[PDB]
Structure 1
């Protein structure tokens, strides 16, 4: 009846925590909270488990008035039966997810950008901003906001 969504990136450090925060935020804005059960973010690696997000991810969120509070956690096979949508940021995320995904598990694995439009507003792939600069985080924010809206528009 209610749906559960998980966002995934490589280290659950720069991108997916941002996707989770922005998505929770848009759901609020639109009064769709009743339609959701769980909204989380995980990383495929365990390198930043227990850590708070990249300070640039937090700064950008704060800059747009988006609340963010998260500690890194790693996706586990059990999660494939707990979420309706497991959303990756780039193709390498998707490759790893499809490999660990139990056959017959419930989760639909997709690229956040599968909800992108065919018009050039934003690039489809949400690129890793770690080696980039604050400008890359700002663009990730713009991308995620846009796909969050398309998702709410087309999936409910």
Structure 2
């Protein structure tokens, strides 16, 4: 087939604040655009195992609920083997990218990229989805705006 079903994995450090939000929003945008048929797996993970088994940060959940975006997730860690199970392994910031590239096996199919690679750079949003941990609910809302923006760009540019 010329239009293969795509598998996407969103990565952050804890799979607690940003990546579960990225997965939730991306699935939401796929559904709104009736593009389910173009995707196999859409998941989120963390480079660390610090929040394995836990539901997302209450602030990420509150932001998703405020926008009417469903979210249901338990923390999980990205592994070297996953690089052959996903077409895109998308990090939030450069520190995520650094770690992913160091565990990326040679020849694996996944393309490691920054979600912000899909930014238009037209000034609407910043490219790096910054860790909101030490910030507050506004930083989480901004991550939501960034992720929604890149999700729509990704759907328009990669399919």
Same fold (TM over 0.5): yes
Supply the distance in 2 between the matched residues of 1:52 and 1:105 (Cα, whole angstroms). 30
Could you say what the CA RMSD is over the residues aligned between the two structures, in angstroms?
0.4
Structure 1 residue 118, shift from structure 2 partner: 2.2
Query: Structure 1: 5+ residue runs without aligned partners?
Result: none
Structure 1 residue 133, shift from structure 2 partner: 0.2
| Cα deviation code 1:17-62 (max 9, x no counterpart) | 0000000000000000000000000000001000000000000000
What is the total number of aligned residue pairs between the two structures? 156
TM-score, reference length from structure 1: 0.99
Supply the distance in 2 between the matched residues of 1:59 and 1:74 (Cα, whole angstroms). 23
Supply the distance in 2 between the matched residues of 1:9 and 1:82 (Cα, whole angstroms). 18
Moved over 4 A (4+): none
* Paired residue secondary structure (1:37): strand
Structure 1 residue 149, shift from structure 2 partner: 0.2
The alignment status of 1:114 with 2:91, answered yes or no, reads no
Supply the distance in 1 between the matched residues of 2:121 and 2:104 (Cα, whole angstroms). 29
TM-score, reference length from structure 2: 0.98
The answer to whether the 8 A contact 2:17-2:57 is kept is yes
Supply the distance in 1 between the matched residues of 2:146 and 2:138 (Cα, whole angstroms). 12
Residue 37 of structure 2, aligned match among 20, 30, 34? 34
